[PDB]
């Protein structure tokens, strides 16, 4: 009860209260001082926890520490020792986000007269000197400089007015380092490749510019809340502590550092001619606002209602257009590469809740943002485009599919493959997936009918009278009647063993059997699932060869080439039921039969779903092997303190299974990359021979899909890096394709 | 360790609905619910086909199986479904984000379920449909019309 009471007290401070923040801080300080002699370690741990897991209230939690230090020097010293221990553990653990929040806490604790400025200056000197280390990854240096620069907006004035000489030396070293950094990764991370109206500059470059503007402004931001300013009278006399000499942990092979990111900028002060002047793109206030909003979203990503409530009630020293900032931060998280911090549907639901909470103003801002995003579609990345399409379709579904389509009439005259008409087509198709064709037709203007999708109806090649001359029509009719008569598998073999092979793989046989089966089971998903599961044996016996699986996939596409969702679901079931392996589907995606539909979003959602299925299967088998090994170890230790033989045998079998699963995963990724390389190389050679522009919508889509696969599965491709560089991505490769691989390598190096 | 305020997960908590025809005590039903992967999706329209339900619920993760709520005698939809995901995390995400989202302009309401057994897909209502459909009196086009009692 004591611990939970202390936790509730500490967390409560700064929320809805009838009293001011200073009064709450003083009360909490007193209370803690009362409970100091009996819960010193408990309080220390709780404070280090709120410091490490609640960055969005950072300054508040430092003022508390600034008061306790004024009351108990010993307590302050122990606290800073514990904070340096937590920092060293987070660094040895590879928890660099927590480590940077801790560094920010120490930096702002320097402002409360807890930590002496010279000691923090020395720590920052060590941080910067990390940049002078030899043969270390550039991500380490990047992060160590980032920590310092990100902490500067909170203690920069103090550090400069105390040690301006060493501060200038630090700044000179930081500039010398930043001038020689590598920016190879920026193109793979920019949401928009266009340099106007908002360049998507790297986070370190942005932050450096902001710090330079803050220094030119005599270190004055007018945004950050500093409750300890009102306590100056009590804090000036308080004794200051000296941090022990800090040496960053040495680089190790197993250490993993955060990958560089690119600031997502889409708004401008001109976009709100009525509200408060939005902070400039290079103002430190803007960076602090985005960081606080990101932390708020990351701290409440489970409770969408509470997340919306916290976002809407975000405090600031000076009034700002908080609606625009929230929308921008939400879109930045949604459109962030490689992947968003959380599932993509969370952002949609959070935006819906935000609109519900503030219907008077926010919906207009959302519509304006949508229109902006659409106007700048000519360069947005296709991954961000897919995320935008999904979110917008879900939004329209949640708002009676109402939108001012006429405002986008400019897209009706453009090439249908242009990002704008393509985006409209995909949005309409997704809206249809959540509705019926007729409704989608009824809602769009008639002039947009050329974009509306196609009715999702089965295409039975042997249904029309003109099909009587097709080979296998009689066999098709016999199979149809047998299916209608609940025939058994052996009967179906008897009716099928009479199909004339065109020349252990009969294409006509598979084609007829699958066309008939799908056609008779083409009134509901459940029907198809039952027809696939019941006749599983026939499927596995007719499609023994990988070529047979490819033929099955091709026939399934031909039957349902108008119902992409059905195609997707069917392929999923076929790969889970083991009718087709993932390699066959991967080969099918790049097959010529999909060239006309190669750029359509459903083929890539299918490919990604198959990759995810393979990854999950491998992870499950590995986890089972780990559990079996743990059980073996526990049993052996308990016995030491037949069965063993058979268990060890099992373990061996599981290990072989894990090896085979990893081999299949590797083969899947290798085949995918080979097919990407082949298509891009042949396209580039043909374009060069023709002397035409290499930048075409198809090329952009393919290259950015390759980038999407690399970004999505870097975690696994890190293992194959060696073979990828030795076999696939070689020097002889075309520079355009090799550029993607170089960017991916530089992403974490 | 970790702050309990952040651990608060109000959307992934058990509801007050306990199965009335379950074969066992309440305790084992709760045990199953804490590890189940099946969601009962209610407040659906009769016309809602399962393709759109799959398209909506496939946004939280890979779906394993979908069972539509058939009528006891007419064998037609009654406005409820069972969605069985492949992993617990996917079901939790669906409850945290899909719960309370519109579908066919209808506010769907997903709840945890103790799993699927044969005969559960038929509405317990003695009229064939759903008990709520038998007790409600307000008109609803998506739910056929006036309640069975009204007719």
């Amino acid at each position: 009860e004591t611990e939970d009471h202390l936790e509730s007290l500490i967390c409560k401070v700064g929320e809805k209260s009838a009293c001011s923040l200073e009064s709450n801080l003083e009360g909490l300080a007193g209370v803690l001082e009362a409970d100091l002699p009996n819960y010193k370690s408990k309080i220390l741990r709780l404070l280090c926890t709120v410091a490490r897991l609640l960055p969005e209230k950072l300054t508040i939690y430092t003022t508390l520490v600034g008061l306790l230090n004024a009351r108990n020097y010993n307590f302050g010293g122990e606290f800073v020792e514990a904070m340096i221990r937590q920092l060293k553990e987070s660094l040895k653990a590879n928890n660099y986000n927590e480590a940077v929040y801790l560094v920010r806490f120490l930096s702002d604790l320097v402002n409360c007269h807890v930590i002496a400025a010279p000691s923090m200056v020395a720590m920052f000197e060590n941080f910067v000197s990390v940049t002078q280390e030899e043969d270390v990854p550039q991500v380490r240096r990047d992060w160590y400089v980032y920590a310092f620069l990100s902490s500067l907006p909170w203690v920069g004035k103090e550090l400069y007015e105390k040690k301006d000489a060493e501060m200038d030396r630090i700044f000179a070293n930081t500039e010398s380092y930043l001038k020689r950094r590598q920016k190879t990764h920026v193109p793979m991370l920019q949401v928009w490749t266009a340099d106007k109206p908002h360049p998507q500059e790297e986070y370190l470059d942005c932050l450096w510019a902001q710090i330079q503007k803050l220094k030119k402004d005599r270190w004055q931001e007018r945004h950050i809340l500093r409750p300890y300013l009102a306590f100056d009278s009590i804090l000036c006399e308080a004794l200051q502590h000296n941090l022990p000499p800090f040496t960053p942990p040495p680089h190790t092979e197993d250490s993993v550092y955060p990958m560089p990111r690119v600031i997502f900028r889409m708004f401008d002060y001109t976009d709100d001619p009525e509200g408060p002047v939005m902070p400039g793109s290079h103002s430190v206030e803007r960076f602090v606002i985005e960081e606080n909003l990101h932390c708020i979203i990351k701290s409440h990503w489970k409770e969408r209602k509470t997340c919306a409530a916290q976002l809407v009630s975000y405090p600031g020293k000076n009034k700002i257009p908080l609606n625009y900032h929230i929308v921008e931060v939400i879109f930045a998280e949604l459109f962030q590469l490689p992947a968003p911090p959380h599932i993509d549907v969370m952002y949609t639901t959070l935006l819906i809740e935000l609109c519900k909470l503030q219907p008077g103003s926010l919906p207009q801002v959302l519509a304006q943002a949508t229109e902006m995003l659409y106007m700048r579609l000519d360069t947005m990345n296709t991954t961000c485009v897919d995320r935008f399409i999904n979110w917008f379709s879900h939004h329209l579904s949640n708002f009676q599919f109402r939108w001012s389509w006429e405002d986008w009439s400019d897209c009706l005259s453009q090439d249908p493959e242009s990002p704008k008409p393509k985006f409209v087509r995909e949005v309409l198709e997704k809206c249809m997936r959540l509705s019926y064709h007729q409704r989608i037709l009824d809602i769009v203007p008639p002039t947009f009918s050329a974009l509306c999708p196609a009715n999702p109806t089965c295409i039975y090649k042997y249904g029309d009278e003109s099909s009587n001359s097709l080979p296998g029509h009689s066999v098709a009719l016999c199979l149809a009647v047998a299916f209608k008569s609940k025939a058994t598998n052996d009967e179906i073999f008897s009716i099928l063993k009479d199909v004339p092979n065109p020349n252990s793989f009969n294409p006509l046989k598979i084609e007829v059997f699958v066309q008939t089966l799908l056609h008779l089971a083409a009134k509901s998903f459940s029907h198809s699932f039952s027809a696939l599961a019941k006749f599983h044996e026939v499927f596995k016996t007719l499609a023994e060869s990988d070529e047979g699986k490819l033929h099955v996939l091709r026939v399934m596409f031909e039957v349902w080439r108008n119902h992409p969702q059905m195609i997707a679901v069917l392929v999923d079931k076929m790969i889970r039921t083991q009718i087709v392996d993932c390699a066959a589907v991967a080969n099918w995606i790049f097959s010529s039969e999909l060239s006309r539909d190669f750029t359509r979003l459903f083929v890539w959602e299918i490919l990604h779903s198959t990759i995810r299925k393979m990854n999950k299967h491998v992870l499950k088998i590995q986890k089972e092997l780990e559990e079996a090994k743990e059980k073996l170890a526990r049993q052996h230790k308990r016995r030491s303190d037949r069965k063993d033989g058979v268990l060890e045998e099992q373990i061996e079998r599981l290990q072989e299974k894990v090896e085979s699963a990893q081999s299949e995963q590797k083969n899947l990724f290798l085949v995918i990359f080979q097919r990407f390389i082949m298509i891009l190389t042949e396209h580039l050679v043909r374009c060069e021979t023709d002397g035409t522009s290499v930048l075409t919508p198809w090329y952009k889509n393919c290259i950015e899909r390759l980038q999407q696969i690399f970004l999505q599965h870097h975690q696994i491709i890190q293992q194959y890096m060696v073979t990828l560089e030795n076999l696939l991505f070689t020097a002889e490769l075309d520079p355009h394709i090799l550029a993607v691989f170089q960017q991916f390598c530089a992403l974490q190096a | 360790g970790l702050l309990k305020a952040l651990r608060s997960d109000s959307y992934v908590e058990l509801s007050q609905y306990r199965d009335q025809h379950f074969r066992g005590d309440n305790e084992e039903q709760e045990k199953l619910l804490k590890k189940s992967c099946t969601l009962y999706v209610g407040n659906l329209s009769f016309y809602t086909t399962e393709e759109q339900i799959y398209e909506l619920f496939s946004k939280s993760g890979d779906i394993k199986k979908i069972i539509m709520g058939l009528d006891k005698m007419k064998k037609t939809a009654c406005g409820f479904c069972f969605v069985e995901y492949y992993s617990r995390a996917d079901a939790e995400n669906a409850m945290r984000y899909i719960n309370g989202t519109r579908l066919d302009d209808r506010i769907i309401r997903t709840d945890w379920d103790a799993g699927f057994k044969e005969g559960r897909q038929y509405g317990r209502g003695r009229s064939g449909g759903q008990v709520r459909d038998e007790y409600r009196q307000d008109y609803d086009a998506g739910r056929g019309g006036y309640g069975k009692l009204a007719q």
């Binding site: 599961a533 599983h536 790969i575 889970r576 039921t577 083991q578 | 394993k64």
Partner: peptide, 7 residues
């Protein structure tokens, strides 16, 4: 529906 989903 016999449990075929082994993968």
């Amino acid at each position: 529906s016999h449990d075929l989903d082994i993968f």
